[PDB]
Amino acid sequence: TLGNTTSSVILTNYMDTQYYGEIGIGTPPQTFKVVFDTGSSNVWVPSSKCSRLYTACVYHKLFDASDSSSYKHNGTELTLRYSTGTVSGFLSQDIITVGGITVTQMFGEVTEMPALPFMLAEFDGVVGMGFIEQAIGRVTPIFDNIISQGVLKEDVFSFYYNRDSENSQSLGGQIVLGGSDPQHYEGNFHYINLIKTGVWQIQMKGVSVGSSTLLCEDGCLALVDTGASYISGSTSSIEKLMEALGAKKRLFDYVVKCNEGPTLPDISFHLGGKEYTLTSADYVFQESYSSKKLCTLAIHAMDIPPPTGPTWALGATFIRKFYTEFDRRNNRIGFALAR
Ligand SMILES: CC(C)[C@]1(C)CC(=O)N(Cc2cccc(C(=O)NCc3ccccc3)c2)C(=N)N1
Ligand SMILES: *[C@@H]1O[C@H](CO)[C@@H](O)[C@H](O)[C@H]1NC(C)=O
User: Fold this and answer.
1) Ligand with smallest separation from the Cα of 159
2) Which helix (H) or strand (E) holds 117?
3) Please, which residues have CB within 8 angstroms of residue 11's CB and are 6 or more apart in sequence?
4) Where in the cell is it found?
5) What separation in Å is there between the alpha carbon of 74 and the centre of ligand 2?
6) Mutation test of ligand 2: which of 71, 76, 106, 139 has the most ligand atoms closer than 8 Å to its C-beta?
7) Domain that holds residue 250
8) Is residue 225 among the annotated active site residues?
9) Among 318, 217, 210, 300, which Cα is nearest to 252's?
10) Active-site entry in 16, 124, 225, 327
11) Which DSSP helix (H) or strand (E) runs through 281?
12) Is 124 labeled as catalytic in the residue annotation?
């Protein structure tokens, strides 16, 4: 069922690596900073029942069911094993407010929150924008529940991720539920169908580094991940890519001498009928131009395990350049040049 509602949530851009917006849980609402994540399908926030020996719980907002009159107990154990770490807790139900839409939602109350990486998190929790097929504990995802209300103009949601400005007047980003915002893209959308329903993953035809270097020559996969900071490939693909850039591997990232940064070649991703090109300005964190300083790249290696992986992941690095529309009705992803 389709209505006429379009609901927009303003996002905060933290250092070009974390984009989060606000949701309200319970009666009266308890507010949380959440990542709207196409690479996961569960809603979770830290719990009041999280042992304060998990220091990430001391530094985050915690959900207290004892202060909510609309809370409905569940208690089923929940373990969410992600690429960056694991969170664990139990299932709870309450009313969630997201941009003006109110939905009764089953979510995870996290009681085990590792300091690595969650002490680096500016957000409190996660809003999974993925399909029910990838939902842990077969919990109905928030977007499915919003669709059931039949209030949205379209069975779509869109993401705009801005470049990190130090100006407060700068909008960090924006998620539109039910449509797209023409104020944040130009030209037209070019759609690529999903390999299969259940994953925000498409076929990638090839990856070009300048003129001479070529990767994904026989085709590969691309997961379009709003909850990933960087563009990611397999360890092997990233080794060849970084060799072509003249980048040096560190513990968790890849760097170049800052002065060399503006000289790096364009990287192009062949998706559907179009080539999606990122210049060095798009993937280099140009913090300086010093020959005496190292500059990080917004590209890393991430070996995603099956059935989803092996796959590339197009994270915030990609979405900043290309406004993205996630189309549930048609099982496709649309890209347009962001503005
Ligand atoms: C948000 C995140 C914790 C999680 C739930 C779990 C996870 O491993 N990924 C992939 C993944 C891979 C590599 C890095 C990161 C990262 O640094 N994300 C931070 C972030 C937060 C908000 C927006 C963009 C990026 C995430 C997700 N898609 N969702
Ligand atoms: C938790 O929710 C699921 C939803 O299908 C339900 O089947 C289960 O019985 C619930 N558990 C409890 C103890 O309420």
Assistant:
1) 1
2) helix 115-118
3) 19, 20, 21, 36, 161, 171, 172, 173, 174, 175
4) Secreted; Membrane
5) 6
6) 76
7) 181-338
8) yes
9) 300
10) 225
11) helix 280-283
12) no
**Exp. method:** X-ray
Domain match, 193 and 330 both: yes
Is the Cβ atom of 101 under 6 angstroms away from ligand 1?
A: no
Among 162, 180, 198, the domain boundary falls at: 180
Residues 167 and 274 in one domain: no
Q: Is 93 helix (H, G, I), strand (E, B) or coil?
A: strand
Rg (CA), the chain: 20
Please give the distance, rounded to the nearest whole angstrom, from the Cα atom of residue 69 to the centre of ligand 1. 32
Ligand 1 pocket mutation, candidates 229, 230, 326, criterion most atoms within 8 A of CB: 229
DSSP secondary structure letters along 145-188: HHHHTT-BSSSEEEEEE----S-TTS--EEEEESS--GGGEEEE
82 occurs within a structural domain: yes
In whole angstroms, give the CA distance from residue 22 to residue 4. 23
CATH number at residue 81: 2.40.70.10
Q: Kindly state whether residue 265 falls inside one of the protein's structural domains.
A: yes
Q: Examine the fold and report which residue of 156, 180, 204 is the final residue of a domain before the chain moves on.
A: 180
Among candidate residues 22, 110, 125, 29, the one with its CA nearest the CA of residue 70? 29
Do residues 127 and 276 share a domain? Answer: no
Check if the beta carbon of residue 106 is closer than 8 Å to that of residue 71: no
For ligand 2, atom 9, the nearest C-alpha belongs to 74
Q: Nearest-5° angle of CA 157, CA 38, CA 329?
A: 45
Single-letter code of the amino acid located at 171: L
Residues 6+ apart with CB under 8 A from 201: 194, 195, 221, 222, 223, 224, 308, 311
Would you give the distance in Å from CA 10 to the centre of its chain?
15
Number of domains in the chain: 2
Best mutation site among 74, 94, 106, 140 for ligand 2 pocket (most ligand atoms within 8 Å of CB): 74
